[model samples]
Target: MVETEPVQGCRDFPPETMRLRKYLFDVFHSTARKFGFEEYDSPVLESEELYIRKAGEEITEQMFNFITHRVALRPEMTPSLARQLLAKGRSLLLPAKWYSIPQCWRYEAITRGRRREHYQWNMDIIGVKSVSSEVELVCAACTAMQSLGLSSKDVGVKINSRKILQTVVEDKFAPVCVIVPREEVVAQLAAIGLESNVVDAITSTLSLKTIDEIAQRIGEEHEAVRELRDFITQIEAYGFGDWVIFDASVVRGLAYYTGIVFEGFDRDGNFRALCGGGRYDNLLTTYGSPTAVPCVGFGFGDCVIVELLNEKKLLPELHHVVDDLVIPFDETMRPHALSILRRLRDAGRSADIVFDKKKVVQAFNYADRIGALRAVLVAPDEWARGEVRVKMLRGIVLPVD
Candidate 1:
């Protein structure tokens, strides 16, 4: 005898909200395709190991369900995309661009700024193995925002790279990243076990913070450091010098992300990021590909965008097509009156017809209540004469349609 409440971190999207979400998804998809991006999808349910592999042990605890089928509800889309890429076989199609609009789930607490189920649009380039491909994705993301009535000035792209992050750590505070208190790294890794992804737990437990700390700890001469510096130089030459900025602190929590990363956000600072994605070159190899395949993409959610629109008072007026109420005079002409309303509805008109023993004023009131544009009155005399009286719900009466 216990009544239940709504599931946490999930949403019950209303009709208008659904419409707007579709709008964002469609625009993002069509625009990405215009840039030669192909669409792909994976199962809603996947091996539980997939998410835990990329997201980490903490993620296993947060996952919604682990079914008897050895599959788990997908928490993110990038890993699935990577898994798909690996399964596609190594045909060596370099620079293949792909995009997806996926609904991801994360079984966590219900809060003001969190949702368990939401849609995200992700785009990635496979086999390109170049920073320029990442730049193209950044451009695509900016273009999507512009399509939604925002300009480059209204939004900004913050760029970062794992290699860069690792470089700064190695040169400045290598020990902080490397000589982490044995308890933190080893204890976490052991507790994580083989079935779960331990990288996230290990990195989180390590005291790797700030560029200098990482360099001083992990040793300044690491190849990751060199790759990071090179990436910074190429970022400037990528031609988005004004729209993008380099940051060394953006180590996305996911273990699947292996290279350059970027996230787009509103410049006005009214909401969270509109979209985000990064490189996952190691993902293909993790999913059993013969060799690593390069990849990158971004995802945009709908709820935050709608809230942003409403905050800016950018909603349009609702329009109605027709508003008519039809009444049958007496009992004999009711069928004919019903027929008349049906005919009007068939012609793409909205009509409220009286269907019981009631007064004409009641019918009129019903019409007004429903905001019908017109009202039709059917009488035995009118039926006998093959004519009907049409009354406007909000205006003067007129002939029937």
Candidate 2:
């Protein structure tokens, strides 16, 4: 017996295993189009600086960033999307609906449920400044889950606003520090009905040894708090109040996100957020595009989605082309056999021909193994008379005596 160790954090998907992936991809792009989203993507390899500029220090650390002869392997595709938006800023109209499926990279410890690489589907609405755009994305997500056999009962979306956190921090931690406001704000997460363990983690990280702690401090002084509050109120008005909650510690690592931020999780509650995104009003400015546009989007990885489906017992079905198999009893009838197979295929039927001139039983076995719906056995007697013997591979064929 031959045994092999599985690759850490990676998996090989057999044909049947990829059925769900195909289904999801079809649903994702189709739903996006229904909402008028245009498809777009970026190079899988790009400048490492681009990622750091967009996502921040923590993301860079987890990124599978490597220098190639031309550029770095892209850890995410959003920055490139931003680049494109900037390039076409003037030509495009307001509230652009954009979407993409891009392969991404990450460098993580060799573990059972993590991988250094994956693919993600991302969708965004740009140039719209209303919470309506946010709601649209939520609906799209809910629709995708439903298509995958999940209901609202199986999932919940948690929305947080940068403005909400900004408001809460202004009363307590602002005016005392510069950039260090996040530290004080995070420390008070639990008192304001936020997660306590999350607050403790923030405090521990802050008090730990740091040579230049003063320079790193960021105080949430003015705008951030009020903005967060406005977002909470706005999303609540859309009747999605139950699906969202306020959390001061939900600072996305992206420098571009200027307004409301949110993340989605399985309502059954097992792992981290399945996907996350927020508004980035000033991102276009970085790429030399107009600053008037506001954007919001989220990315969902296929790997994690597949894992989630298996847990939920919502697996996909496999489909194959199973129709006809053609074979000749003798080499002399080869041309006739070939023509029959060609006719079947030309007429949009999937037909396979025996090339090795093997025994009749072995040829039948081959047809069965390949899942042929029917077998057309063109024996010498039938071929010579311009007739054919068709046998139904998976079922009985009636005799015409």
Candidate 3:
């Protein structure tokens, strides 16, 4: 007996669904070109040390299996990224622009929406010390969403600086607000050992909307304020003015974000963060580097992205399309069809062949199933004439040498 279902958390994509998957993949690929980010990838399972070291404890739902050696299916992309950079050290170029769609996992038992496995569109820039690096990265994401048919109005970025929160909460407590609801968070503040004035500042500071208001709350000379002001100015300079806003509340979940941080959110409030990344300068140094290399990047999650596309009716109806198919009209012409198939492929056309012998009519019937636009018939007549019938859609054919 066969198990008629996939593994508990696995997903299946047959041709129709895979075609839709390809459309989304191509959008990721197509947008990567606009930013000059080179494609790079690493093992799906990096060692567990790179991860647990960051927090001195297990991160939420670490996707580790019971193997002899300690290892984890990388829950996030940035951890292994440091491994590659540290391996290359000084020889590797500075301001390295790299992007990848990493398959990550977390062994969480969520019912729907959040999956056990996910593809995170990972983009990062390394060795860029200035906040200008943040500007470039944000602009990169903005263009990608814009390219995916989202406008400035559809989504907006909520910007913040962990440095501001660092003053109130120490390193580990810096970003719990990303996950903590207001009720629990305020109570959490009460539990933590802090002066009432500090809690008051935290409450008052987190509520401010505008940069002017933030300045009023935490004077203009504050380190985060200066960095945020510069960051926002540069983003608007790049003409993404409508796509961004200041929100003191956006430091992501227990983050490594040492400096400026931001996350994209839908205006309709249909979902949560589309992506989140920020300056994490200490991670490199913490991992035995002589000096910490400055870095910034984000993971673009698709769990909500596709749903948003469907909600907005922006999903492309993609069929499994082919440029050409080569038909062996009979068993005798099969070898010739192979040569034509190779030639078509060598010429950079999406071409395939009838591996099994079939009549011309049966072969043509199979052709259209792939949405093939062009066909070449290697029949006895065409083979003898040292040519083939170049067939087109709508039954039009041209016999040529």
Candidate 4:
């Protein structure tokens, strides 16, 4: 005999869990729609070349590769989007806003709030060539959180720009960013115009919360700092001021992120990041496009948010109401029960019947188990009277004709 347990790091989703996933997907769709984005999707299987060209080595190592060919499951959606745009973007109108909920796969070690297979809600904007798109992208994610009953205090947006970090590194350290070792990197940063203490503050900017505090640590005159300050003001003007914060250390781990990266995290810092994304304007060119296309987007996964919602007691109830459960008193009344069931269904009411159970008590038990609103009793007398006895379960059992 072989064990029938599900594969490790994978989820079965059953009925109850699938309901929660659907709830999140509904929220994702509605939020994206509110932002004027259209839904799109791609195949689960993609050529390995798509990822190998741009994705980091860590990701490639975890991909499920095929035996004879260079095929692998897509680990993320951005690369596929890049390929799609290169294939058909020129034909489409400018400033395209698109969204997709794609199930991504990876072979990495799974931990709490992490899974091997997960769905990502991706929202991207192409052709609007500015930081404004990044702001709108972040705002869209914030919109999703709000839809899920999460407030600004429940989750915070950590915003930063890779361009800012690169400029700071270039100005402070004379050497190139790639060749510099960690020790030399810090030493070089301290040796430049900034004092050792100020350099330490820059290195530790992740702990700092506000733009004002960040400005105080690294001089406010810096272009990157000013850019961040202005970005904050613009987002604040959009009415999401309290929900976002400037964190200099939020350089997203992904290599594709060129500038203006942000992540959604629990305000209390209790769980992992709920979502993260940024501007990757040059990604299209890597896919063989001759011209550069400005693009910015975000990826919100379905896992961590559900965990956070559970922690906050925001998950919807498991009990779903069925309109009726047809119950026949005995085997002789089964035909009458079937007739009543069809009528109820024809009337657009959700209903069910116990095909195997002949006892009236057994039929009612099934009704109660499924949280039915009413039980239609097809007794011999009721059938002869050309009517059914409907007994309300949770509420008052008014004898109905």
TM-score of 1: 0.65
TM-score of every candidate: 0.65, 0.74, 0.90, 0.84
Model 4 regions more than 4 Å off: 56-59, 111-114, 169-230, 395-401
- Residues 194-281 of candidate 2 have per-residue lDDT tens digits of 5766454444433433212211332333344334444446656654555555444445443346676667778777766677787777
Local accuracy of candidate 3 as per-residue lDDT tens digits, 1-401? 89887766767888888777777767777777777888899998777777777665657355755456777787788878888889999998997988898888877775855668778788888888889988987887788788778888888788888777676453245544666456577666667676667777776677678888777656798877888889989999999988998888675753667788889888999887888887788868877789788888877886677887777788888777788888887787788888888888888889988888677788887788777798788777757867678778753344441
In candidate 1 the C-alpha lDDT for residue 62 amounts to 72
Off by over 4 Å in 3: 167-172, 181-186, 394-401
| TM-score (C-alpha) between model 2 and the true structure | 0.74
How does candidate 4 score on lDDT?
Answer: 0.78
lDDT for 384 (candidate 3): 81
Higher-scoring candidate on TM-score, 3 or 4: 3
Off by over 4 Å in 1: 1-5, 91-94, 167-242, 315-401
lDDT of 4 by residue, 1-401 (tens): 77576787777878887888888899999988888999988888998888888854555688888856678888899889988888886797888998999999987777754578989999999998667787788889999998888999899899876655455443424232324245665666655677676565445554566667756755688765776777788889999999898776665563456777889999888897899988888879888789999888889988899889989888887656688988877777887778778878988989988778667777778888887788888776655656567778762222243
lDDT of 1 by residue, 309-368 (tens): 566555444333346677787677778878887888888877666767777787777777
Give the Å error, residue 388, model 1: 11
